[PDB]
Amino acid sequence: SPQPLEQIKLSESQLSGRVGMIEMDLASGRTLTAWRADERFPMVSTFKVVLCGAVLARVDAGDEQLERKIHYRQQDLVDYSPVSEKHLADGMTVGELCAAAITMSDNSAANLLLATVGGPAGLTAFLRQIGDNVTRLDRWATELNEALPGDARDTTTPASMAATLRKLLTSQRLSARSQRQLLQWMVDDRVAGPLIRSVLPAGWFIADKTGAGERGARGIVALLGPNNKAERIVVIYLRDTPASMAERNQQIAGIGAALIEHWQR
Ligand SMILES: OC[C@H]1O[C@H](O[C@H]2[C@H](O)[C@@H](O)[C@H](OCCCCCCC3CCCCC3)O[C@@H]2CO)[C@H](O)[C@@H](O)[C@@H]1O
Numbered sequence: 001s002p003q004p005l006e007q008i009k010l011s012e013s014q015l016s017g018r019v020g021m022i023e024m025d026l027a028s029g030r031t032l033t034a035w036r037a038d039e040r041f042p043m044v045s046t047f048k049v050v051l052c053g054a055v056l057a058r059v060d061a062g063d064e065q066l067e068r069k070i071h072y073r074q075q076d077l078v079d080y081s082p083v084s085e086k087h088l089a090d091g092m093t094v095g096e097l098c099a100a101a102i103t104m105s106d107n108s109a110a111n112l113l114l115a116t117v118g119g120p121a122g123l124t125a126f127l128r129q130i131g132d133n134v135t136r137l138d139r140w141a142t143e144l145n146e147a148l149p150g151d152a153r154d155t156t157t158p159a160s161m162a163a164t165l166r167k168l169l170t171s172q173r174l175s176a177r178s179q180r181q182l183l184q185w186m187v188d189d190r191v192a193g194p195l196i197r198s199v200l201p202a203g204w205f206i207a208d209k210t211g212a213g214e215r216g217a218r219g220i221v222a223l224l225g226p227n228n229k230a231e232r233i234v235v236i237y238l239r240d241t242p243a244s245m246a247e248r249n250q251q252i253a254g255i256g257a258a259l260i261e262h263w264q265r
């Protein structure tokens, strides 16, 4: 594999779309690679990690409990609810909802949680409160994946998302237990985690949240590192490409391969 930047460029050439990427040391925030880092990209399902960060902030303040059981109705369900559709009779706890939203990309679970933090506007205010003045959520679970060209709704930038994830996971804005919980939910991703591990060389740590939308939109926010350590935050977004999902996945994997083969920068 070529150098990371060379591979990112190759990916845009092959996909005919824009790639946005940041590679950052998790512990210090040192930026190693930045490509279209200040350009907007649809967050798609990656917004779910920030959502649960807001939920944990409420728990830390005593305004919420991960144990609290939420009962909902069938009419509350939206497209793709693998876990939440199984609990119309018994409900789900706030913590279970975050696990479902993050590890199974359950959209109804995400919407139920979004309601608890004041909706898209409330989540955006939370982002402003932790110093992210760029990321914005405007719509609910399914509609936010529309990815219309030039539409600023439901977007982030690679640099903003990386800084925000770092703040939630390590800045002590969240309590120690909450930072540990958010990390474990990412470690537990069932959608892409197992697959990524199956293709990673032995010794490489992975925690992640992925997402997909229209017009080729794709995204992944992840923690990656050798020696089984979450050394770096890697955020990659793709937008406006007509490529198959398989090729978009292969190109993201290719950027990962370049990182792995040239890690010591
Ligand atoms: O020299 C380094 C390594 O080179 C190869 O490893 C390959 C591996 O066989 C392949 O499967 C993977 O594909 C990349 C898989 C990446 C998957 C997702 C990455 C994510 C993670 C973070 C966010 C964005 C991308 O590349 C590596 C590096 O070339 C060798 O197989 C391995 O024995 C050796 O230790």
Ligand SMILES: O=C/C=C/NCC(O)CC=O
Binding pocket: 044, 045, 046, 105, 145, 210, 211, 212, 213, 214
């Ligand atoms: O990103 C999180 C969930 C996204 N759901 C919609 C799609 O995956 C795109 C279908 O075209």
